[PDB]
Design a protein around this ligand. Sequence first.
Ligand SMILES: [Cl-]
Ligand SMILES: [Cl-]
Lengths: 504, 511, 510, 510
Amino acid sequence: THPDISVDVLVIGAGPTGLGAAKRLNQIDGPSWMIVDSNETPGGLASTDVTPEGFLYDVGGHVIFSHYKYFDDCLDEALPKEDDWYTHQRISYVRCQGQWVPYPFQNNISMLPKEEQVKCIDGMIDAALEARVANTKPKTFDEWIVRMMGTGIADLFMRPYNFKVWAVPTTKMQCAWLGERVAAPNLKAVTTNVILGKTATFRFPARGGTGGIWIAVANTLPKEKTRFGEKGKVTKVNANNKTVTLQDGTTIGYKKLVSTMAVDFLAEAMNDQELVGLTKQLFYSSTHVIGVGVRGSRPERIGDKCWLYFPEDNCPFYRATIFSNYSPYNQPEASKKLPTMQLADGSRPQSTEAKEGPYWSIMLEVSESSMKPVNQETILADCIQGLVNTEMLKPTDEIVSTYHRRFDHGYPTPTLEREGALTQILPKLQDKDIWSRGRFGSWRYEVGNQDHSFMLGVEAVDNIVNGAVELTLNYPDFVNGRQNTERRLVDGAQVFAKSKAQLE
Amino acid sequence: THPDISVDVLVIGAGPTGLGAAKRLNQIDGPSWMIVDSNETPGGLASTDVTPEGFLYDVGGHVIFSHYKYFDDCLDEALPKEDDWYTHQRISYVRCQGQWVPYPFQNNISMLPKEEQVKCIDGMIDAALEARVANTKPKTFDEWIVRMMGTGIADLFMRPYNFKVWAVPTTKMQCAWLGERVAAPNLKAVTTNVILGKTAGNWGPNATFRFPARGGTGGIWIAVANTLPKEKTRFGEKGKVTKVNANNKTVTLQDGTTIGYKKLVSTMAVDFLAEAMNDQELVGLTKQLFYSSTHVIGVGVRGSRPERIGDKCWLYFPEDNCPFYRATIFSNYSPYNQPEASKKLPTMQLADGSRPQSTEAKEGPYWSIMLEVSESSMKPVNQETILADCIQGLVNTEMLKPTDEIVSTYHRRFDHGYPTPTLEREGALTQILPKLQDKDIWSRGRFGSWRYEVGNQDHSFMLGVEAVDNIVNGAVELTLNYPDFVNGRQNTERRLVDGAQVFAKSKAQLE
Amino acid sequence: THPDISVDVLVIGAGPTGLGAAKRLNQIDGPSWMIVDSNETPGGLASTDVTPEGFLYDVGGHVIFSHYKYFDDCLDEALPKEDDWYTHQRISYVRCQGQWVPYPFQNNISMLPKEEQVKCIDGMIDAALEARVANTKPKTFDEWIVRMMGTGIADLFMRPYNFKVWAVPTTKMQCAWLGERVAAPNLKAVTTNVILGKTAGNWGPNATFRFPARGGTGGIWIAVANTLPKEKTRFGEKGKVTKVNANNKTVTLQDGTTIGYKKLVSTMAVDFLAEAMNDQELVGLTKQLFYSSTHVIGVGVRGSRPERIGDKCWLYFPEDNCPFYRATIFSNYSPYNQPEASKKLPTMQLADGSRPQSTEAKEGPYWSIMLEVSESSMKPVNQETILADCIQGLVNTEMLKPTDEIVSTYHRRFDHGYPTPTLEREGALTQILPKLQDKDIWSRGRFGSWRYEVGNQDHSFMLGVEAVDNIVNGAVELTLNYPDFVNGRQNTERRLVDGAQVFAKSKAQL
Amino acid sequence: THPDISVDVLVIGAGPTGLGAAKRLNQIDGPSWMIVDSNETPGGLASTDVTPEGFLYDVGGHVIFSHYKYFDDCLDEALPKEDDWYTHQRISYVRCQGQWVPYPFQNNISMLPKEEQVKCIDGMIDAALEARVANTKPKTFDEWIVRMMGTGIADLFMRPYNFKVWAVPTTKMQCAWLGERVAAPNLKAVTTNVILGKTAGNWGPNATFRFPARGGTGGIWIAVANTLPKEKTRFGEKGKVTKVNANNKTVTLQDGTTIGYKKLVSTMAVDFLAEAMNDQELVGLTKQLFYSSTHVIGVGVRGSRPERIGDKCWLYFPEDNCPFYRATIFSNYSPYNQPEASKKLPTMQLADGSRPQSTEAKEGPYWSIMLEVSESSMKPVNQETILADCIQGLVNTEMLKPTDEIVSTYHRRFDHGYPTPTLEREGALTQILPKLQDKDIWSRGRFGSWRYEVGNQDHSFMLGVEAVDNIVNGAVELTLNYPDFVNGRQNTERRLVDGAQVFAKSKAQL
Ligand SMILES: [Cl-]
Ligand SMILES: [Cl-]
């Protein structure tokens, strides 16, 4: 009994991780392979949605720093024109007590009341003294924060903010994921800034938002090796006889499997009780992505802002961005005409006539868990009110468009129990020739950015084919702390082979 | 052959130390005793001079702050009237970059330029981190400074200032002496003040303090001397000691008088004692000691008390725009330190150095300033020019406008001014003092025992008292050997009227 | 209404503290004074008792190290002959796991089993490392113990021993009383002795102490008292004080006699003084103080001095195979502490607790053992069985063979035995003493001021001397308030003959 | 103008490193390649020599612990029979004051004089206390040692031994090359062993290493080379490289042959390369490197194996009663390292250095010893007398009785023996390697990249493998730049058969 299709390497999922595996498989051009996804549009959670009124919203952020030349090579290939990209300056602010405090927070306590500055400085002094004598390392995220910042800064920012982000207490999280850097505060730089009173770029696609990158990357692949859409939905994986079954009944035989779906779904699709049980020990939070389109020129108070962080309790979201700042093509042009749905204060607008722009746009994120639930019916309104309370929207601003989507698997949580589970789950799948990789494929946030995830797929294939170490998967500190320039979209294998076929 | 006079206990010198010995001897009224001094006016280096134009000057605007009730008892006995004393609150600043920084220098960085504050705070951060782990103690004054303040504050103040005071580099002095002299900065306190822009200025035991209404500090010692039986004192040329024969326990006076003693308390500089003894070994050891001379400069000036001056007491001068290290507004201590307003005086010169528009005697009121300048083999001074240089320094510091009228000048150089706490000091004293002790000589006092940590007038007085108490009652000489012990407590046990005098008095009535 | 007697200074109590006050007063010979004691024989709890069979036992130890020349002058004066004293070598042992471990204990773990040595060294390594980084000081005796010794050595000796001594857990006691010495171990010396297997060679002649030839320690205090003008002493029932009226400064004796004073030096237990004053506030504060009772047991036995026992001095007992915390072969201190050989005595019992085979009086020679047992609310003792338990304890520790013949026993219980350095002590004393001071009452002594660190005979003596020096000459009471200061120096200034007496005498001849 | 030969990848040198490159290139079977060596026999400085009398001696030691599955695969493929290998227990001893001190030295101070134990333990106590508080990293090999062991152990072993090894004082060497773990001594374990006097634990299966039955170590590389296609190798005089033109990527051989390359893997000493390149700048930088020469000495002797020396071990010699720093009983590794019993040989001399009694050829059995002596401008050696001195050293260390019959001797001096981890090494290499890289030259190996940390046979093999992987597949050269990473993990990902070959083979069957 033979499957409808047979390939050496099967890739499940066409998010960044799956596309990475596909790109390196395509480059190597050795073993046979194919990639499937239930979504007709590749990009997974790094896709970009659009509102009926033409406002774009990324559902999974954007890369700010690439750690790898290989990732760069693929983006350059996908979007090879200078005008394909806008290049912006890396910046950030924290919203604290009516102030926009620049990153890094501790280096700008100067902008807080003098009383708060005292509590913060006393906190770092204590922490700096203890660190001088420390002979152990922190065991929880919380301990890490305190040793690093002092109780002062920890209570102002780190603690409350991180709870808003992870939907889980900082006491319930590990810290290893943060890196090897010794937990020791830079007291001198902090006080120096307090006394003096004083206080890097990234590219973003011009059109299509982040999702446009992955569409263009996928378009470089040989179309007949892709199966995207309902015809590409996987319904079961038979690990014992290495066969996958799709929704439409198609069967696929594989020798090695690279699975980028959530590892808990994989265990279900495998009907593996042991893996399902191990898999349930993992924790994750859901996230709500909220989009707000509004009429008007970009407000003075807002400027060239990007990520904004919100520790305080006058708004449910933990971060927001002025998405309209990243690219003029993220929202409709001025000439386009749209009706006002409501004002920022939640009341009916004066006129309901479709009017001109220009427009700007805000995007934000709310976290959710069994330890921090959210009312889905009221969350949109609360967020908008939150934009008011934080002085991002005037109560008079006119809202032209709203976007609200909830993602069940939003963040894989770095809980104290994560590694105990992963060190069992991953090797067990490995023994079955299954490479489970990705944000939820391998569940490691420290390597959960688009560039990391992409490379997790690239390296899994490199392990399958060339016996390479999976460095990003098992040594995040090693890859994050170096320049990764060795692996290129064009390696010696292809140069030599191409040159050979030329004089032959 | 007998000497002209014989006493159980002879006291040489009638400064604070000798007078302290005399007072306890007089209170005990047991063994016979007498006290001699080459000066006709008692008070030693705690005396007061006056210019022909009527301006009083101490040897450093002395200030009474006592660690002993017994010292208090004697001052109260000598000057028993409420109006004998003015009581003040210390108003002090350090002169740094056109600013008056309040006394605990470190708590007032908030008054320095921001750039400087940074260097200071960085310095303390380092020091605080090394202190958390230190397992040794400082060996020099300099290491002590750095470990306490950080290189920042050390360079801005401590180092330059202390060289101006001691006429010796901080790296050449020990550090077992500064317990109650130099403040101990706390990181939190300091940074909290720099944040709040608020101040603090109560450190040290100098903060109320009483000063004598009349005659200056010297007036205290004259009044104390007057409590003694005059016939047991020998003050003047007739009291000048020329020779000390330790072997047959006899002293020789200038007029040839000979005095036999059983026990000698000597308050003259220990290096002079060696000479007077004709003892080569001691003269030698004596050489290994070090001291700095000091110039006391007085300046009287016409005018109302400038509000730019205010109620300043002693001001500190680390910077190089003036020769003096410390200065005081003496006219602030008492209305009797300078002539009253009605008195008429001619202007001698203007602060800038030029002649006065008129050489006619004019009224007051008046105010007064006293300066000190240190001198040594490592930091010489030009005696002919030093007076002018100081006046010029008063200008550069904005104490005197170039326009101010100088009515009175005073200048006097004291050879023995400060007993220098060098690194070699204790190595010398731990030989000199025991050797004198074996001859039944109690050498005590500012230059008698040469320890600055107990060199104030109250310490010195008590060195004399305690020497007598050891001689007579077998008391421990606590102030001499344990400065930290006496400075760290209230010494209230020893009184001008002890149980011994009460019991003997009440027995005399019943009999 | 005038009292039957009036003096400038009244001293209550003729223990070492009282006698100290009397001696300085007698030397000064200025203000008038007298000294009373309810006991006919001076010496207080530093006296020496005797059994009907002629065995001596010190009730309150003996001085091993004198910190003062003044104390020396007075003992020299009291017992001026060379043959008035024996001079012995200073040494000590701890009884641990069948071993006599020499002082100090930590430097001799070599004698213990290797397993136990491991735990000890491990504990001190930890302590050493923590001390390298410590920035706080110990708050309890227990913490002080651990930081100094480590848990290993602490559990073997310090902890169990100290609980047996103070009859109070170490966690309940302060540690300032131990001095200002940094709580930290000398790892190198301890590991050096474990490796070398040897201890520091005998420093002989080494630190020696002197002990009186006759009459025991109590003999010192009888002779000291005899240098006093007898008419100024009132010892006996005729000297028992029943009431102290602080307000009009009057003291009332048993026989009804009334004494008026200007200054009072009271060396009786400060809680008894509170009582005798009828001051409720004081009595109240006085309750906050804690003390343990002690049992002094004496055993006289027949035979030459056995090989196993050795040469005198204190022995310490951490373990639970005996109720006592320390003991000493008293008969080693002087041949006059017990009957000579020719004396004939009947065996009372054997060490095992059984009747002897013969009850006929027989020759000696003899030897003798003295030991102490503490008692308190947290560590009670059965007064009927304690003697037997102690004797059995002597067998268990291998001090007596079960066959050894017991000729004499001695058992006496002292209500006030040790003033306990509890965490609460200073909070109470810093109120009690100043308050008594404001009434011209100098409460001084082992129980007069309640401070064990200055509770030895020389210290207590000097508390008396210094109180008088404060009353008369305004001297600082150094021993009372700065024990670390006096223990850390050579106190040579104050002498039995001071300059005052020299000058005065020299003048009387002229 | 075209060269006689053109390949994609040219490999110079057929030692472990060169053969490593060749193995991976051969496995990949993609780009064309060839490998050249001036030696007719492959093995480089890991080859085996034989004396005329039939005694074998490794010139470059043997692997004790392999860090890579890939290295294991290749050794397995080359020597696939069970009886191709012997497997021994990995142990080690240090010769200190007449004793054989087992590894590790510190855990065995027990068998030294008690006085030495004292200095050692005292040293570690200091080190341990400073380590509690340290906030900086060691800057020299010497400081690292002091912080690790303390001055006591440093003086007894570390300092003297390492000078004998590196021919350079420890103060002149870096320490990063040693690893990343903090310099903190395990004091408890050290003192626990001294106390217990033992060196034991609950234990499990003992650690082992394998050694080739025949041909010695050099037999591995001969067999590894044999698995390569012979026509892609050029070994012997015909393979000697004399010139390297980096600008037009051409190499010239002794016999005038020219070889064009696209990428070069050079395993010859990097100084020689700079010379062969005629590149002034690289010659200059190259001068800043430092190395020591080494003498390898072999001694065949008659007799059964003496009980005094029985194990297949290294022996280390800190003391100055012998010029060599390490030695081993090679005859213990394999019966085939020396002539069999029946073989008859004449005696050349006795251990004492005197003529034999009879010059007749006599049977065995035989055993063998080999040892090493360093040499440099800071520690010269007399080449004429070195053999005798070493033999005499063997006597002084009680390895040879003065009566032992020496049947065979061996002496050979390698100019490039150890690449020295000097303080200036990295400053030089961080310029040299990258500059060669920019010319498409991968200089790799013991003296190719000059890093002792990764200079073992397995490390070197892998330097070759990873260089090929970087050239072809863009792999990270982990062994080259991250020794700590590769040494602290099990490297199992890279196999002699990877997916690429499985997929390719399986495809060719459809
Ligand atoms: Cl930040
Ligand atoms: Cl060396």
